[PDB]
Design an enzyme around this catalytic site. Sequence first.
Site, PDB file in Angstrom:
ATOM      1  N   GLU A 125       0.914  -1.185  -0.028  1.00 35.80           N
ATOM      2  CA  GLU A 125       0.014  -0.016  -0.021  1.00 35.80           C
ATOM      3  C   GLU A 125       0.837   1.211   0.192  1.00 35.80           C
ATOM      4  OE1 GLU A 125      -3.235   0.183  -0.412  1.00 35.80           O
ATOM      5  OE2 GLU A 125      -3.991  -2.104  -0.121  1.00 35.80           O
TER       6      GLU A 125
ATOM      7  N   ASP B 110      -6.474   6.398  -5.043  1.00 34.99           N
ATOM      8  CA  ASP B 110      -5.963   5.267  -5.087  1.00 34.99           C
ATOM      9  C   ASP B 110      -6.036   4.694  -6.500  1.00 34.99           C
ATOM     10  OD1 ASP B 110      -8.571   4.300  -5.655  1.00 34.99           O
ATOM     11  OD2 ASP B 110      -8.593   3.230  -3.717  1.00 34.99           O
TER      12      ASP B 110
END
EC number: 3.2.1.17
Length: 163
Positions: free
Chosen positions: A11, A20
Site C-alpha cells: 500500500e 488510489d
Amino acid sequence: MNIFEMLRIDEGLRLKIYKDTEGYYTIGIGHLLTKSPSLNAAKSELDKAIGRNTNGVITKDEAEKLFNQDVDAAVRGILRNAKLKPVYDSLDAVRRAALINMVFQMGEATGVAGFTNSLRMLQQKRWDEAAVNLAKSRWYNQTPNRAKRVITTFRTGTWDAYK
C-alpha cells in the site's frame, strides 16, 4: 515478515490525501476515505476518522493508528463471514496473511467471499489450481503486480514474493 509489513509494502504510506488506483480518495497506508468524487467529502471523512481538523494532512503516528484499526477490522470481517471463516481457519499462518491482504484491499469481506471457486480450492489445499483461478479476475487484471505477490504467497505458503 508479517501482515503489517506485507501490507505496508503493498500500500505504501502517504501523509496527504491521494487517489488510489481506482481514483478514490485515500490517505495513509491504503485507508480509503470515500468513493465520492468530492474532495470536501473526503476531508470531512478524514477529520471524522482522526478526530481533528486536519486540512487533508496527517502525521505518521496518525497513519499508523488508522492502519492498525484497518488490519483489525479486516480480520474481524473475515471471522464474521460465514464463507471466509472456514477458509481462514483451514490455512497456515502465511497464507492467512494473504487472505487478510485481499480483504483489506477490497475493503470488504463481501468482495472476497464472492470468489467461491478459489475459496473452495484454497480450503482443499489445491494451491496451483487456486493460483490459476485467482488470476482470472478483474482484481488480477487491474493490479497485476500486487495480485501476483498475493497469489504466489497462496501458492507457496512462503514470503518469497515479498523478499
